[PDB]
């Protein structure tokens, strides 16, 4: 089985060929990071920073998002939310329309879940994420988000571009910890709680466009 | 209305005359702590230790618990829980059996909630608590519990007796923070998250009986 009506059909081959998809799309240091050989960084309390994705998979996902074109979002109301009122608006493309929600959920349940279990002793993860979308921030389309938390036990923020070369500006700002993640990594990602002990704030971007993929896991 | 069918009928008079209950039950320095001029202590990161209840209230609660006699608990399985299995068995009496759960909820909504809102900016509290029981820590009966977490956004623990004079032992130990509560206060209460960022293990009591109050807030 191989759906040929796709720009990058190998992206959905995770179910058919897990070994090849993992060897091609996952970061080379992901195994080293999971094995416990350093790599993981904790610049702020109750936060982590380890490599998750590689250049090829990130570029393919960015190209697919560009091919989708319909950069929805930006209005206070939400059409994909049951309540119909979204607290924070941002220009983003949902994974449901793109059809990558199932593949991303499987990838998170395979690789992301063991990482979360290893980082926090005594914590069992079922990888139940109800919201997963990639937001594109532009100097004229979507500015930095207002200071707000995430409606999830843990919130993961993954960058999709190389810092500096692709976009100029900043990332987030932890007001509680008085720390700012000013050096995002294209291949790495952060998985920290955002329910009660994290009042996340968005820093602004001056030049270029920045794309970040955040999935609300365990809500 | 003043029902005398209790050892301490004034313990149920929290709502009848809120001023009288606040004046005769709450901690004298609790108002100063709510004013934000000290008293509140943070021995560990993202942890609070401030006085909540007065000695008279603690004595009344201890006497009521002793007179109740329904000190159930001690098995991995349980009948009070809907699931029927308790993750961490403990000899504790739920507030539902005593019937003071309404009073505890009212006190949490009146005094605990504003402190939580003031202490942690950007968070809204609604005093949503379900699991709350008083467990007596006895070295001969209930030894130290294994390290575990809490299935709630926040956890509150209040001492019910003077350590050393009444019981000999320890408090809690933060596995991921290397923080040990060796000098807990009868009036002070421990408020911190217990879902993901903190793994805690209780220290073992040695002599006497240590009475503690456990409440799962925002489950």
UniProtKB/Swiss-Prot annotation, chains A, B:
Q: Where is the Fe2OG dioxygenase domain?
A: 128-219
**Tissue expression as described in the entry:** Ubiquitous. Detected in heart, placenta and pancreas and at lower levels in lung, liver and skeletal muscle.
Disulfide bonds, which pairs? 44-179
- Glycosylated residues: list them: 29
Positions of region (Important for dimerization): 153-196
What is the annotated quaternary arrangement, including any partners? Homodimer.
Protein encoded by which gene: PLOD3
**Which residues hold 2-oxoglutarate?**
80, 137, 157, 210
Q: Which disease is it linked to?
A: BCARD syndrome: An autosomal recessive connective tissue disorder, secondary to lysyl hydroxylase 3 deficiency. It is characterized by congenital malformations severely affecting multiple tissues and organs. Clinical features include growth retardation, craniofacial dysmorphism, popliteal and cerebral aneurysm, cerebral arterial hemorrhage, skin blistering and easy bruisability, and osteopenia.
The entry's free-text remark on domains says:
The N-terminal domain mediates glycosyltransferase activity. The C-terminal domain that mediates lysyl hydroxylase activity is also important for homodimerization.
Q: Where in the cell is it found?
A: Rough endoplasmic reticulum; Endoplasmic reticulum lumen; Endoplasmic reticulum membrane; Secreted
Question: Which residues are listed for Fe cation binding in this entry?
Answer: 148, 150, 200
Q: What does this protein do?
A: Multifunctional enzyme that catalyzes a series of essential post-translational modifications on Lys residues in procollagen. Plays a redundant role in catalyzing the formation of hydroxylysine residues in -Xaa-Lys-Gly- sequences in collagens. Plays a redundant role in catalyzing the transfer of galactose onto hydroxylysine groups, giving rise to galactosyl 5-hydroxylysine. Has an essential role by catalyzing the subsequent transfer of glucose moieties, giving rise to 1,2-glucosylgalactosyl-5-hydroxylysine residues.
Q: Would you tell me the protein name for this molecule?
A: Multifunctional procollagen lysine hydroxylase and glycosyltransferase LH3
Name the consequence of residue 153 to N.
Loss of dimerization. Loss of lysyl hydroxylase activity and decreased glycosyltransferase activity
Upon changing residue 150 to A, the result is: Strongly decreased lysyl hydroxylase activity. No effect on glycosyltransferase activity
Mapped onto the parent protein, the portion here is 520 to 738 of 738
């Amino acid at each position: 089985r191989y759906d040929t009506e796709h720009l990058h059909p190998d992206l959905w081959q995770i179910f058919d060929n897990p070994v090849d998809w993992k060897e091609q799309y996952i970061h080379e240091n992901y195994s080293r990071a999971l094995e416990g050989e350093g790599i993981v960084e904790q610049p702020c309390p109750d936060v982590y920073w380890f490599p998750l994705l590689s250049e090829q998979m990130c570029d393919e996902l960015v190209a697919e998002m560009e091919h989708y074109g319909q950069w929805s979002g930006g209005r206070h109301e939400d059409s994909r939310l049951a309540g119909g009122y979204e607290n924070v608006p941002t220009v983003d493309i949902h994974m449901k329309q793109v059809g990558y929600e199932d593949q991303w959920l499987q990838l998170l349940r395979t690789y992301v879940g063991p990482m979360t279990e290893s980082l926090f002793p005594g914590y069992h993860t079922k990888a139940r994420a109800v919201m997963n979308f990639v937001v594109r921030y532009r100097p004229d389309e979507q500015p930095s988000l207002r200071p707000h938390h995430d409606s999830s036990t843990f919130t993961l923020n993954v960058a999709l571009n190389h810092k500096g070369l692709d976009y100029e500006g900043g990332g987030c700002r932890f007001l509680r910890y008085d720390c700012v993640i000013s050096s995002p990594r294209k291949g790495w990602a952060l998985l920290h709680p955002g329910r009660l002990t994290h009042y996340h704030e968005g820093l602004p971007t001056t030049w270029g466009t920045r794309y970040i993929m955040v999935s609300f896991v365990d809500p």
